[PDB]
Amino acid sequence: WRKLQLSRAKLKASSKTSALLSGFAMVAMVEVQMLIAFAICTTLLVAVHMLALMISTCILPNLHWYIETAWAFSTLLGLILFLLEIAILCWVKFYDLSPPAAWSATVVLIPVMIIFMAFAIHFYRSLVSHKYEVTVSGIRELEMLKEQME
Amino acid sequence: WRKLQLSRAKLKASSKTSALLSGFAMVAMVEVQMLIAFAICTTLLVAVHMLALMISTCILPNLHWYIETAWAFSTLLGLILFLLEIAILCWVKFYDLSPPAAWSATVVLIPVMIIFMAFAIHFYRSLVSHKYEVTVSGIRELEMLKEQME
Amino acid sequence: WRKLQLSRAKLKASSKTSALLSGFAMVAMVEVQMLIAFAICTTLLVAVHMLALMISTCILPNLHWYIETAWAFSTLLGLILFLLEIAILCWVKFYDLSPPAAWSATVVLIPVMIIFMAFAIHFYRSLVSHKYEVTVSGIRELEMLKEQME
Amino acid sequence: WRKLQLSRAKLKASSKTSALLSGFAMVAMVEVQMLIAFAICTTLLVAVHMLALMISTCILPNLHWYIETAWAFSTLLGLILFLLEIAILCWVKFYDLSPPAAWSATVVLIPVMIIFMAFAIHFYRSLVSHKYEVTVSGIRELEMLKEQME
Amino acid sequence: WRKLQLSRAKLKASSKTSALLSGFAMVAMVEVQMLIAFAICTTLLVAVHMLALMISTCILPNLHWYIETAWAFSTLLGLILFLLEIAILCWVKFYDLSPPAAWSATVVLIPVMIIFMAFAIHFYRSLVSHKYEVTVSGIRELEMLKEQME
Amino acid sequence: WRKLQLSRAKLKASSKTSALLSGFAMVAMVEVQMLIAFAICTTLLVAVHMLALMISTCILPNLHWYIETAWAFSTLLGLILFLLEIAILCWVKFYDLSPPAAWSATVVLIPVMIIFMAFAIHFYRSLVSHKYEVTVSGIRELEMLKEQME
Structure with missing residues (x-):
C-alpha cells in the first residue's frame, strides 16, 4: 500500500508542477514581445516536462528502475531550467532600459x-x-x- | 483496488494537464496579436485534449482496450503538439525583429x-x-x- | 464503494475543468479587445459550465438518471463549444492583419x-x-x- | 462514512470554483481598463464567494441545515452572477466599436x-x-x- | 480518523484559496499600472495569507487551540481584505473616466x-x-x- | 498510517503553493516591463521553491530530519520572499507616477x-x-x- 501511494502522489505533483511551469514560461515569453539563449532555454524547458508527463501516462497501464530515472532526471532537469529561464527573463526585460540591474540577476x-x-x-x-x-x-x-x- | 486507483489517478491528471495546456496556448495566441502553421497547430492541439477530456466523462458511467487507445494516443499526441506550439511561438514573437534568434528555436x-x-x-x-x-x-x-x- | 468514488472523482474533475475553461475563455476575450458569433459563443459556453457546476452542488445534499443527463450533456456540450471558441479566436486575432492564416484555423x-x-x-x-x-x-x-x- | 465524504468533496470543489472565478473576474476587469452595472456586478460576485469560502473554514471546527443554506445559496447565487458578469464584459469590450455584436451577448x-x-x-x-x-x-x-x- | 481528515481537508483548501488570491491580486495590480489605500490593502492581504500558509507547514511536523486561532483568524481576515481589494480595484480602474460608476462599488x-x-x-x-x-x-x-x- | 498521510498532504501543498507563486511572480515582472533589489528578489524567490520541489521528488523514492529541514526552511523562506516581492512590485509600479504612495507599501x-x-x-x-x-x-x-x- 505504501508503494501505491508513492506513485499516486508523485503522479499528481509531477503533472501539476510540470504543466503550470510550461504554461507560465510560455506566456512570459509572449508578454515581453543572450538573445539566442532565451529561445533555446524556453523550448528545451517545455520539452523536458512534456516527456516527463508522458511517463505518467505510459506507466499508468503498466525495467521499472530505468523508467524511474527518466521521471526523476527530467523533473529535476526542468526545475533547473526554469531557474535559468527566469534569470534570462530579467535580463531580457531590463535589457532595454534596465541593463544595469540585469547583471545582478545572472550573477x-x-x-x-x-x-x-x-x-x-x-x-x-x-x-x-x-x-x-x-x-x-x-x-x-x-x-x-x-x-x-x- | 489497484485497478480502480489507476483510472482515478489517470482521470484527474489527464483533465488537469489537458485543460491548462489548452487555456494557456489559447491566451498565448491572443497576446502576440509558418504563418499558416501557427493557426493550424493551435486548433489541432486544443481539439485533441477536448476529445480526450470527453473520454474521461464517457468512461465514468461505464472494448475497454479500444477506448484506452484514444486516451493514451490523444494525450500523447497533444503533448507533442504543445512542444510544436511553443517552437512556433518563439518563431512568431521574434519573427519581427528577432528572426536571427528565431532559427535556433526550431533547430x-x-x-x-x-x-x-x-x-x-x-x-x-x-x-x-x-x-x-x-x-x-x-x-x-x-x-x-x-x-x-x- | 465503487459508486461513491465514481461521483467523488466526477465532482472534482467537472468543477476543475469547467471553472478553468470559463475563466480562460473570459480573459481571452478581453485580451483581443463572425463578429456576432464570437459574442454568442462565449456567453453560451460559460452558461453551460455554470449550470453543470450547480449540479455538483445540488447533488451533494442528495430521478437520479435524469439529473445525470444534465451533467453529462452540459459538460460534453461545453467542451464542443470551447473547441468552437478557439476557432473563432484565431479568426478574430488574425482577422485584422492575420487573415492569411486565420482561415486555416476554421478549416x-x-x-x-x-x-x-x-x-x-x-x-x-x-x-x-x-x-x-x-x-x-x-x-x-x-x-x-x-x-x-x- | 458517506456523510463525511459529502462534506469533504463539497469543501474542495466550493473553494476551487469560488476562488478561480473571483480571481479571473477581477483580472478581466483590469484588462479592459451598463457602466454602473459592471462595477456593482463584479463587487457583489466576489463578496458572495468570499462569504461562502468562510463557511468552509467555520464548519471545519464544528442549525446544521441553516448554515447549509448559506453555502448552497451563495454558491448558486455566485454562479448566476458570473453568468451576468461575462454578458456585461462583452457589452463593455465591444461597447466601443463592437456595439452591434454586444447586444447578442445579453439577448x-x-x-x-x-x-x-x-x-x-x-x-x-x-x-x-x-x-x-x-x-x-x-x-x-x-x-x-x-x-x-x- | 474524523479529526485527521479535518486537518487534511483544511490544509489543501487553505493553501489553494490563499495562494490563488495572492497571485491574482498581485497581477491585478500590475495590469492597471484611495491612492494610498490601494497599496496598503494589497500588501496586507498577501501577508495574511502567507502567515497562514506557514501555519500549514509548521503544523505538519507537529497550545493546539492557540495555533488554530491564527489559521481561522488569518484566513477569515484575508477573505475580508480580498473583498476590500476588489472594491478598490473598480475605484482605481474607473477612477479615470469611470468615476461615476466607481461610487456604486464601495456603496x-x-x-x-x-x-x-x-x-x-x-x-x-x-x-x-x-x-x-x-x-x-x-x-x-x-x-x-x-x-x-x- | 498517520505518518504516511503527513508526507502525502505536505507533498501536494508544497508543490501547489511553490509552483503558483513562482509562475505569478514571473509574470508580474514581465507585465510592468530598489531597481537592483527587484531583480535579485525575483530570482532568489523562484530558486528557493525549485530546490524545495526537488525535495518532494527525491524523497518519493526513499538523515530524515536533515532533509526535512530543507523543505521547511525553503518553503518558509520563499513565503517571506514573496511578501518582500509584492512590496517591491508596488514600489515599482507606482515608482513612475505613484512615488508618493510607494512608501506606504514598504512602511x-x-x-x-x-x-x-x-x-x-x-x-x-x-x-x-x-x-x-x-x-x-x-x-x-x-x-x-x-x-x-x-
Missing part, C-alpha cells in the same frame, strides 16, 4: 545554482554508501547462520 | 522531437515482446499439465 | 469537430444495443426456469 | 438564465412532493400496526 | 460587508451558548449519580 | 514582517520546552519502576 543566479546541484550530489553520495553498507551487513549475517549451521 | 526543436517519438517506439517495442513472451509461456504450462494428465 | 476545425460528434454516436450506438441484448437474454433465462418449473 | 443570456432558474424550480417541486408522500405513507403503516395491535 | 460594498461580519457573530453566539448548555447538563447528571450513590 | 511591510518572524519564534520556543519537559518526566517514571524493582 546571483550562480550562487543558488551551484548549491542546487551540489546539494543533490551529497544526498546521492550518502545513498550510494548505504547500498554498500547493507551489502556488507547482509552477507555477514548469512555467514553467521552458515557457520553455526555446520 | 533545437528537432533534437527533442526525435527523442520524444523514438523513446515511445522503444517502450512500445518492449511491451509487444512481453505479450508474445507470456503467450509462449502460457501454452507451455498447460502442456505440462496436459502431458501428466494422460 | 482544420471541421475535421476534429466531425470526428468528435461522430465518435460519440458510435459509442452510444453500441451502448443501446447492449441494453436490448440484456433484455433478450434476461427473459430467456426466466423462461428456462419457468419451463422446468412446470 | 442570448436571457434564454439560458430562464431555463437555469426554471429547472431548479421543477427539481425542488418534485422534492417537496416526496416529503409529503413519505409523511402520508408513514402514518399509514403505523395505523396498520396500531389496528392489529388492538 | 454596494457596505451591505455585504455588514452581513458578513454580522452573520459570524450570530453563529459564534449560538456556539457559546452550547458550551454553557453542556456545562449545566454535565454537572446535573453527575449529581444524579452522586445522590443515588449515597 | 506597512515592516509591521507584518516583524510579527511574522516573531510569531514563529514563540511557537518554536514552546516546542523546545516540551521536548525538555518530556525528558524530565520520562526519566522520572523509569526511576519509579527502578526503585520499586529493588
